[PDB]
């Protein structure tokens, strides 16, 4: 992890 | 490669001390630091943090000069570290992206991108604005209906950190989805100066394969505009006649901000201002302009023009001129009169309540040296991107509205203060006096920080000041803050929190 | 370390290339070169001059772009290497000297030696213009009393030069003794741009063993100014009160231009112009500063206005104000209106006749937008130099005259022409319309070229106007010439010949 | 106007 | 005046 | 009036 | 094989400066040079241009001295380069043309053309003009009815030139179509002198392959020629005998003056003038010759004859008289009379009022001690010629016209120019004074020069002077003068300007 | 006087 | 603000007097004066020499006791002004510089500076050397390579002086170029103690603008110094390796003693003497030290180490030891045995002939206690000022040469007077026993005075004792010395005449 | 050495 | 007058 | 000097 989204 | 210049540090018995403790473009705050401390490289910005974190001196940067509020020179700030002498604009091999450096000015950036590479940011406007600010907190400007925010070419920012420990750390933060400070580089697409730590660095790049050419990695200016400024006469400008304008306006706006729109080659500024002798930004007006490049050109603007003025009487409409890209030299910059600027975002026009309440505050400024409400061109190639994937969540928004007095003599701040507050909160008072994210509005940009955002005699919404900056972006804001400057070393009125 | 900017050819279909064909200072002239060449390196100039001496196209290095002549915009000049790109200020702890490009202009050379190391040169006021004319033409300003020519500091040059068989080479002669290349060294300390080679980098250090801290390497800056401007009126002035001011002015500059002065921290100039409307250095007035340091400043000030406003009725004169050294940024700008300036040195004052001819042209000047004789404040420290030492041949001077008009509107060049011309040839009407060195005059200044002054029309003397403006250094200037240029690639009106 | 300044 | 200029 | 404040 | 004589520099204290400065014909005209220039060789004549341009000198050539107007002889004119030392009349075998320097006389030429080869060129009578000013002005005499004008011979002009550096510059300037100076060549077949450099040869040729054969190389002359004038009394020359004669001989003129006439081969001219006793040109009179080779001539004569004098009492024919080309050698004259002389074309007859014009201001002349009208013989083979073939437009005129004033006392100059112009100006009235082309008139002819002609005062046509002359070619010559005299170092009061 | 001339 | 300690008038009934009077360093020098004055401020100095005047006694001011001469012990001295009690170290802010008051040893000097603002003076190492006579005398020591003598920081005195009248008066005499006392200041920058007046206050500070920050107003000392004593043994030492030592050290000191040397941070002391058992002085070594903040410094040791004993086996060379500024207390000061110096300047190495005496007298030294001759590192950073700028002449030297003897027992003060004098006569025999300024030498220093250079028997140079001292620096001493002293109340053995 | 004394 | 001195 | 060696 470390990125965000939202997917 | 020469040595850098630098450090030095500046004390009060300095000659230097005076010019670099009045730098700050708003002559409404002073501060008197205990000393200003000039860095001429990465590891000077190192050193001259862990000498305030040592100190326990309260510090903040200066790049540019420009910030809204007090976040710079205010009683408090002990130290200031400011980044004039970094200014490096450069292609960088090792990262296939241009360097640019804190202590750059817009205008420095715009002629060297320009001769060296035909290439430009669609960054603001004003020639001295400071890279070190204007881009970690979302810059924009005329092209951004056409290229975006400045934020959608960040590749990369160096950043000078302190960790739980006290220690200066450097890191290097690119958007590689695979880069384990990637966070990092998020928060600096719109979060705004002061919060994480020095900015050292920037990269700009197209997101993008375009090869290793650097003449392809930002984008082209155009090489022309033409141009044109509408002029209003306040004589004959009835409330039927004002209001009809900012309904055609609006309308306009919202019919004209997609990113398939012939128009994102398009931009101007309403400008409703009382008309200032020694002040030609004054009076009310609207500059527009729009890329020559296209055949439609002259179409584009004679249309938009024709929108905008159908059933204003006082209309003046001059011929257009055409003019280069960059032909007279931008700006210069420097100290100001004292100015307090208020914004908000729009989705949809002023309504008419809105429009009304503009209106009633604009006829009733006696004593008020300059105020002013600009309606500002946006959207267009900005809104292609998703409200998560920059530290900007307002995606979908046609205009930034500005709410601004500006004052010649320190005594009249009170009575220009209760003006533009009043015209503000005139505006916005169906929702506590300020822009809550509705239908309507979006909030507020954080490179128009206002402090009345945070205080509670004049935001009644309960909407916190960080949800109308951040939106849904301020929790993961507030966690990159906390991972990066666990002990809040970088903060001031409007800072992310721990 | 990044690798440099450019190369670039700008040819006409280029959207750079009116920006560049049109960044000259003075709208009298323009050419319409084939290319304009961006560099920013030693090498890509090397390569840049091999080029044009390959293809036989005449060439022009632009720097500032503040030439007062047509030596780089003119229809005969096909290729111009532009220097825009070429801007290092640094200490350069191999010369232990400052490293300076040609690209720079004053205003940045001001402030970045200011900012990192409290020093600065004593060049010249104009902000915008470029390092690479300024210096090697013999550049002065209002500290030039206090500190001598920026050439007094010049340690170095690198230059490209042209050898007999058409090659480029790079050369850095400094002034050390035992210099090989000493010579070419000499004729940068005033010889004038466009005639040896391209100067690519000056280093600049005062002449003292002073060891190696870069900040008693130049003269440090006055930390403030007492500053007042005198205005006079012309309404109220008499043929004899205009007399009198002028032989006040003059001869207090005969007595107070030694070298062990304590005027040596005071400079004035006399502007002796019409008044135009939104033009604030226009009119009759006479602006002053002295360095504020020593206790006796405001004193020195005072004795130097009442000597010369002695009997001078139309006289007003302020309160000084005390300002902080570059405390505004010098204001430059770019490509401004038409006009001519004449020049001569003064080493006693303008005669009787002499005044009675300025008083005559300036008080016939119907039809003219700007006209104006300047008696700029020189002499002190340039006057410990010998005048073979340099290639400033004129080191007892106490004034630089000027002869000043401009015009607004392209047709009416002729008429300002003439004025400008008469004016100059009434004053010098004694030794053939120019000013030969004689008891009172000394020739020319070589940064204020005038064509004029090779024009055996205009020039009658029977003086060449190689030895007004280099009088008993232009032998050693023309083998300098023959040595380094043996082709002749570089010219133009006002050029060395071998 | 759209310009900047102030001069 | 003294400084440069034009405004 | 209609100054205000709070300084 | 010799070198040449000169060069010479003649000043003031030098013997021959007087001889000299006093050899124009006009002595209406003086000025006082700094020094006249004798010059031998073409090498010469570059080296005195050269020293004019370096010291600034106004500069005229002499070659006859025969101007009609102040070219060379003026208070201005500093320098005069005197071609009397340039005299070869040659065949040159490498250009297989003549070769004819400018400072032989036209009595020089033909005697010499005539011995050597029993060729001749068609120029003027007067047998001291020189070749110099009257080639490349369009010279034309007795036989250009017959032969042309001496310019359809013109093969090549080598020139001295100035070029925009002020270095001197020979050229060879060919007839030859793509010859790259073909121009040059062009705007001396009737630009005039003093306008695009110094000529210092000209090569004189029939256009037709020939082979290499000297003798039909130019024309020949005839063997013999039949001449005879016709007297008119003025004490019985009534307005009604006056307007007679005047219709007869224009109509006369407008009938038989094309390239396929008989009357080719005869010449006239109408000398209307006071009589002057001792000037044996003065007088009311028609000479008239005509090429007795031809077995028609005696018959010529006599019809030209009766047809002029048909209905006119006071004519008086005497017996006609046979004579050998040649048989007295060509004069003359020296310096001679102060006088003016303004000139026309004609296409047709002067109308009835311009015949009244004529005749009102010869019967009203006292204090005029000669004033004449003189109606002079052209077309014919002149006329087979396309107007911008050559520098001469008019190619289909039957006269030229002179209105000519001469006084014996310089205190008398303003009563004789009022009354020639008075003159001119009545004939000229309906089109400003000035023959403007029409039906009637088609300017004027540059070898008469006439100052007036650009006067606004005396010329109200609003025509300027250079259309009267050049009419169509102005253009042209226009370019030719600024591509070969940028620097407009040859000039006068009626030469093209760049 | 002290100016000169010639008129 | 407390009242100053005495006056007390010493006489010989009192038990501070024979403390007083034996507190000379050189016990060979006594008197018996009839009081010892105690003075405690400038008033009461001034009461003093005026009571001495007054009652015509001799006088001689004592500070710290170190004179190598009889100045101020002796029959004849009837007064001692001892300046024991003005002790006073501080920053002044009225002179901007720091006040030191000549009681105070060289010891007190360096701590207090050091420990209140972290600077230093570049003199003496002996710790209880006076400031009253080493400072006027031209001090110099260790850091003087870096730095200069003591007298290019001394920016004003206070001196006590006596008119023709006999009065005395407080004089303050500065730096400043316009100083009406400007003479007397520059007198006492090398011109010596006991000439013009008791000196009661020395200001000291950099002659640079540095502002106001007393921590720039005098050099920093070195943090930390890098040292070692290279020991050399006697038996065995040849001639030839003698020779060869001393031929090495003198060539080193001759390459690198230049300004701009990185050696201007080392100094030496190569000292050739018996071996003395108590004596740690004593012997034959050459101590070093150089600046240890610049990291060069343990390379620029072990160079110099290496050309030094090139070819000469030293007895020990020990690792360096890095020790801190004043790490611990110079030592004292009191009453030494009886000793005679003589000395000279090196501006060369000594001559392969003077070397030879050198080790000819140091090999016979039957009966001496202690002989020895020192060479002793100088120039650097001294020989940046111009001889005539201050009373010091020499100015390129890169050696001060003592030689020394010393004795136990009075009884064998003449041959050990005897043994020295040899051993300076025979070096300097070929310019008359002495250091006649030439290509080696150049004089002698005042601060190391001896008597013997103005005996005719043994100078017989014919240069007298004060060109040796002063060389051209005399006639400008006299003049000072005539104006301040008219009476000649100060005077000794070596005192300048006026 | 280098110190001064006398021990 | 017109030229000064003082002689 | 001019000489030679080495001592």
């Not at chain 2, 705050?29 to 590891?43: A, K, R």
């Not at chain 2, 060296?116 to 603001?124: A, H, L, M, S």
């Not at chain 2, 090489?223 to 002029?231: D, E, I, P, R």
């Not at chain 2, 929702?431 to 935001?459: C, E, F, K, M, R």
Request: hydrophobic share 35%.
């Amino acid at each position: 992890x470390y990125x965000x989204x939202y997917x | 490669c020469l040595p850098p210049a630098g450090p030095v540090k500046v004390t009060p018995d300095d000659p230097r001390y005076l010019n670099l403790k009045l730098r700050g473009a708003n002559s409404r705050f002073n501060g008197e630091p205990d000393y200003i401390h000039l860095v001429g490289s990465t590891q000077q910005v190192a050193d001259a943090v862990e000498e305030t974190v040592r100190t326990g001196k309260r510090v903040a940067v200066r790049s540019g000069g420009h910030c809204f509020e007090d976040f710079v020179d205010n009683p408090d700030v002990k130290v200031i570290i400011d980044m004039s002498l970094l200014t490096e604009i450069a292609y960088d091999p090792s990262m296939n992206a241009f360097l640019i450096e804190p202590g750059n000015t817009l205008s420095e950036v715009y002629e060297k991108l320009y001769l060296g590479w035909n290439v430009t940011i669609p960054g603001g406007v004003c020639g001295g604005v400071g890279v070190g600010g204007h881009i970690c907190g979302g810059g924009y400007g005329p092209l951004s209906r056409q290229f975006g925010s400045v934020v959608d070419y960040l590749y990369a920012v160096e950043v000078v950190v302190v960790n739980k420990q006290g220690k200066a750390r450097v890191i290097v933060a690119t958007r590689e989805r695979d880069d384990p400070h990637h966070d990092l580089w998020w928060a600096h697409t719109g979060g705004g100066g002061g919060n994480f730590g020095v900015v050292t660095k920037y990269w700009m790049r197209v997101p993008e394969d375009v090869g290793r050419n650097p003449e392809r990695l930002l984008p082209k200016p155009p090489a022309t505009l033409l141009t044109s400024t509408v002029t209003f006469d306040w004589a004959g400008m009835t409330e039927a006649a004002f209001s009809r304008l900012l309904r055609n306006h609006g309308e306009w706006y919202e019919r004209n901000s997609g990113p398939d729109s012939p128009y994102t080659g398009l931009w101007s500024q309403l400008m409703i201002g009382n008309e200032v002798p020694g002040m030609g930004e004054s009076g009310f007006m609207m500059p527009i302009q729009v890329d020559a490049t296209r055949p439609d050109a002259r179409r584009l603007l004679d249309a938009h023009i024709e929108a905008v003025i159908d059933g204003v009487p006082p209309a003046e409409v001059p011929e257009p001129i055409e003019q280069r890209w960059l032909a007279s030299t931008p700006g210069r910059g420097g100290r100001g009169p004292a100015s307090k600027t208020k914004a908000g975002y729009l989705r949809k026009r002023l309504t008419d309540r809105q429009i009304q309440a503009v209106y009633e505050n604009m006829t009733h400024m006696d004593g008020i040296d300059y105020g002013a409400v600009w309606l500002i061109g946006y959207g267009g190639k900005v809104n292609t991107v998703d409200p998560a994937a920059t530290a900007l969540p307002q995606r979908d928004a046609i205009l930034k509205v500005n709410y601004i007095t500006g004052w010649a003599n320190p005594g009249n701040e009170a009575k220009h203060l209760t003006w533009v507050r009043k015209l503000y909160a005139d505006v916005y008072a169906e929702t506590g006096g300020v822009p809550v994210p509705n239908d309507v509005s979006d909030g507020a940009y954080i490179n128009y920080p206002d402090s009345d955002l945070a205080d509670p005699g004049l935001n009644t919404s309960g909407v916190p000041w960080h949800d109308l900056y951040y939106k849904g972006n301020h929790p993961r804001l507030r966690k990159v803050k906390a991972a990066y400057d666990p002990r809040n070393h970088f903060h001031h009125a409007l800072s992310i929190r721990p």
